[PDB]
């Protein structure tokens, strides 16, 4: 969905216009640029004819996007992926007479991290508007980010190929034993929601009892009045002094490696063998290649 911000600010001016005359004259005028009439129990048939001075584009002047930003919304949902086999090596103490502490090789995996977002409730602001949102990943241990385009249905996908590495581990291998070390990359994903915000300025133009040819008041004050009165639906607008803040929404998701698990098997009797030990190993991350796209 999309909010046409400029058109909604024009309707904001029309709401204040009609609502204020309805109080003044007990009429039932609707927000409109068209001439309309209404029967007042205290006044008779009354006419509302907005002049060319205020109609259409001239309902708002000094319209400006002042700032735009995006913030994490709620608690993202993290999940664990299927572990990915990374390789294996042998720790051979079959000919040794002493127990040894033997260092494993480093294991590695070439992984494509992906971050994507979708603008689900867009803001049509009259100018290309973007904002970057940051979120924690991997149970709060790293920070990631994603750039929203505020137009409805905008999608972004960013990928990085990275190399994950497990540091060498020290394994006790008893005399005469042969051990096998198998390595697996653990993965995770995250998804969540973003709030999209724009602070916009402007002056709303209405005919009114005090200004029968039209007068202008900042949109922040006009919105404050209209929300207090119940004139029109501006549920995703908030006053901010003379300006208003308008809110949209997006989604995001991301995937990444989390760590390595090493599985130690006794293969002395020769062919999988008994698992003797498992080790969680923190990975070392090195970026190789990156690619950006927007749809
Ligand atoms: Na409208
Ligand atoms: Sm909320
Ligand atoms: Sm939520």
Numbering used by the authors: 24 to 293, 300 to 324
Direct quotes from the study:
Domain I, corresponding to the head region of the molecule, displays a non-contiguous fold encompassing four alpha-helices (α1-α4) and six short β-strands (β1-β3 and β14-β16). Domains II-III adopts a topology representing the conserved structural core of the aerolysin-like proteins. We observed a more extended C-terminal peptide that encircles parts of domain II of Mpp75Aa1.1 via hydrogen bonded interactions between β17 and β18 as well as β20 and β11 (excluding the his-tag residues), whereas ETX has a C-terminal peptide that folds back on itself, thereby reducing the extent of the interactions with the adjacent domain II β-strands. Furthermore, the Mpp75Aa1.1 structure also revealed that WCR-specificity is likely conferred by three domain I residues in the β14 (W206), β15 (G217) strands as well as in the connecting unstructured loop (Y212), which are located at a different part of domain I.
Bioinformatic analysis identified that Mpp75Aa1.1 belongs to the aerolysin-like superfamily of bacterial beta-pore forming proteins (β-PFPs) found across all kingdoms of life. The Mpp75Aa1.1 is processed at its carboxyl-terminus by WCR midgut proteases, forms an oligomer, and specifically interacts with putative membrane-associated binding partners on the midgut apical microvilli to cause cellular tissue damage resulting in insect death.
